[PDB]
Amino acid sequence: KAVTFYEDINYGGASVSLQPGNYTLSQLNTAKIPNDDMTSLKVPSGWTVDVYENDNFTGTKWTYTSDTPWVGNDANDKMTSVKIYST
Amino acid sequence: KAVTFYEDINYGGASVSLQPGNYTLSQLNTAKIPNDDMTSLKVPSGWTVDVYENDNFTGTKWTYTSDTPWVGNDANDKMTSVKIYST
Ligand SMILES: [Ca+2]
Ligand SMILES: [Ca+2]
Ligand SMILES: [Ca+2]
Ligand SMILES: [Ca+2]
């Protein structure tokens, strides 16, 4: 049970799974998730994922609460930091 | 009435008690709680403890709301910062 971020549409390409927490760009990069590269994600039922356009949970924020095969053009390849809640 | 963090399993070893607040690594170190050393903890009923893998409330976050004699292998010896709420 985790959030999995995918590099291409429809859960294709490289993928990394994360547990709840508040992840800066530095931490994403260590977890092998590159800057501005997230296109789809799987979110466990009851969890919340707050994707931020800029580092340290700033800039525009997109919220996902279910599996999302396509984040849309505005949010695509924009993730630089992310907060994940098991709520 | 406080949260007490223990260095070994089943509330054994060195222990430090803290009141609600948001504690960075620096502050934990001053309170005599070393980095990456927490294995069990006591949480007062109604309180919440958010344990963070990295400093300044970032990285993976584990949540405890009751006495926990064993934090588990993934969370063991990982506390670098912590938020404690009397709620
Ligand atoms: Ca991509
Ligand atoms: Ca970005
Ligand atoms: Ca320990
Ligand atoms: Ca740590």
TrEMBL record, chains A, B:
Residues bound to Ca(2+) 2? D36, E53
Provide the binding site for Ca(2+) 1: E7, D37, T39, D77
Residues noted as binding Ca(2+) 3 in the record, renumbered to the chain:
D36, E53, K78, T80
Give the residue spans that cross the bilayer: none
Q: Which domain of life is it from?
A: Bacteria
Could you tell me which residue ranges the Beta/gamma crystallin 'Greek key' domain spans?
Answer: 1-45
Similarity section: Belongs to the beta/gamma-crystallin family.
This one is known as Beta and gamma crystallin
Q: What is the organism field in this record? A: Clostridium beijerinckii (strain ATCC 51743 / NCIMB 8052) (Clostridium acetobutylicum)
Q: Which residues of the full protein are shown?
A: 120 to 206 of 589
